[PDB]
């Protein structure tokens, strides 16, 4: 993930919030993420996680059980929604 930069700065991909919501619904459904067929709609990105070499960055996903609304919150600030 360090090999994805934009003008030197190292950003978290915009498709990383899809594989994070897709790996959190699979857990919610008790299935392996590679055996679940998902369809995310109206995915929005409000900020950009700033990676850093030799460091650890944490992010909290939260998928609403029935309806299917998901967050990728990083504390109190939203990094993505859909």
Ligand X SMILES: *P(=O)(O)OCC(C)(C)[C@@H](O)C(=O)NCCC(=O)NCCSC(C)=O
User: Could you give the maximum distance between any two Cα atoms of the chain, in Å?
Assistant: 41
- Judged by the rule CB under 8 A, the positions of this chain that interact with a second copy are 60, 62, 64-67, 69, 71, 73, 76, 78, 81
Name which of 10 and 26 has its Cβ closer to a second copy: 26
Strand residues in the chain grouped as ranges (E): 5-6, 9-10, 62-63, 70-71
Least distance (Å) from ligand X to the CB of residue 51? 10
| Closest by CA position to 80, among listed 65, 66, 60 | 60
- Judged by the rule CB under 6 A, the positions of this chain that interact with ligand X are 6, 11, 13-14, 45, 47-48
Which residue of this chain has its Cβ atom nearest to ligand X in the complex? Answer: 48
């Amino acid at each position: 993930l360090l090999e994805h930069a934009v003008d030197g700065r190292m950003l978290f991909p915009a498709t990383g919030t899809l594989v994070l919501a897709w790996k959190t619904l699979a857990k919610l459904k008790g299935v392996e993420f590679e055996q679940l067929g998902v369809q995310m709609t109206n995915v929005q990105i409000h900020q950009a996680l700033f990676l850093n070499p030799g460091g650890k960055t944490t992010v909290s996903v939260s998928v609403m059980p029935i309806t299917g609304e998901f967050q990728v919150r990083d504390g109190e600030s939203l990094i993505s929604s859909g």
